[PDB]
Design a protein around this ligand. Structure first.
Ligand SMILES: O=C(Nc1cnccc1O[C@H]1CCNC1)c1csc(-c2c(F)cccc2F)n1
Length: 243
């Protein structure tokens, strides 16, 4: 059945499992097909967040199969943000604001469906380059959202907050916001702020000279060491740099 409705094209990336470009046979709609080995949570999380729309900041799930294979939308043309930055350098504050804005709303959306992505990072933001639009991908390591802390966590280390590194403490919202701060620093500076555990734990920020102080202040807020010092998502949207 899979091989009846869909044709796998080139490998696009191989942790998540593996993602391919493909087409849906009947109408040659372009899709991405994500293969996983060993029903997975990702399908459920994608369902919850897709259901009735749901959001333009989130890649839609279109179909899934056992043999596990997920059929995802594929904007044409598209590039993840990591590769974009590799090729083009930091986004610069005007387009970061817009993309950062979109990511935050996608995250808010997800939280509204009770889903925490838990792996926000630039490899996981797809830029749909026709519409000028960021989309969240890769829910393979997300969870259902709760007040209660986690240790279910298997994220990307360099986007993980100090209290996870130090205490194995994962609080969904503060850890999300921490990762947003990493991402934003990524976007405007062209690299992550902290490469090693020790750097995360110290959390010391040295901004390149080109980063505006407005952008600095927001990033410092998101990357506060103590998780309760961190803004909520609404505070971030209301930050003066975000206007
Ligand atoms: O779901 C996706 N991706 C993903 C999911 N789940 C886990 C990992 C995923 O991606 C990996 C490759 C790029 N970043 C991580 C996805 C949908 S469309 C797409 C995509 C594209 F349309 C053009 C170029 C590169 C692309 F990736 N990707």
């Amino acid at each position: 059945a899979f091989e009846a409705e869909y044709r796998l094209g080139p490998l696009l990336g191989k942790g998540f499992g593996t993602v391919f470009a493909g087409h849906r046979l009947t109408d040659r709609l372009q899709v991405a097909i994500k293969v996983i080995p060993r029903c997975p949570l990702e399908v459920a999380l994608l369902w919850k967040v897709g259901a009735g729309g749901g959001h333009p900041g989130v890649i839609r799930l279109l179909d899934w199969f056992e043999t596990f294979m997920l059929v995802l939308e594929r904007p044409l043309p598209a590039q993840d943000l990591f590769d974009y930055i590799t090729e083009k350098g930091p986004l610069g504050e005007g387009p970061s604001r817009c993309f950062f804005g979109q990511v935050v709303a996608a995250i808010q959306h997800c939280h509204s469906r009770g889903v925490v992505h838990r792996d926000i990072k630039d490899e996981n933001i797809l830029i749909d380059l026709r519409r000028g639009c960021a989309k969240l991908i890769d829910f393979g390591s997300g969870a259902l959202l709760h007040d209660e802390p986690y240790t279910d966590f298997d994220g990307t280390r360099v986007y993980s907050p100090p209290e996870w590194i130090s205490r194995h403490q994962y609080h969904a919202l503060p850890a999300t916001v921490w990762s947003l701060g990493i991402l934003l620093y990524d976007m405007v500076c062209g690299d992550i702020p902290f490469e090693r555990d020790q750097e995360i734990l110290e959390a010391e920020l040295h901004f390149p000279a080109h980063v505006s102080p407005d952008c600095c202040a927001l990033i410092r807020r998101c990357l506060a060491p103590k998780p309760s010092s961190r803004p909520s998502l609404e505070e971030i949207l209301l930050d003066p740099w975000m206007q």
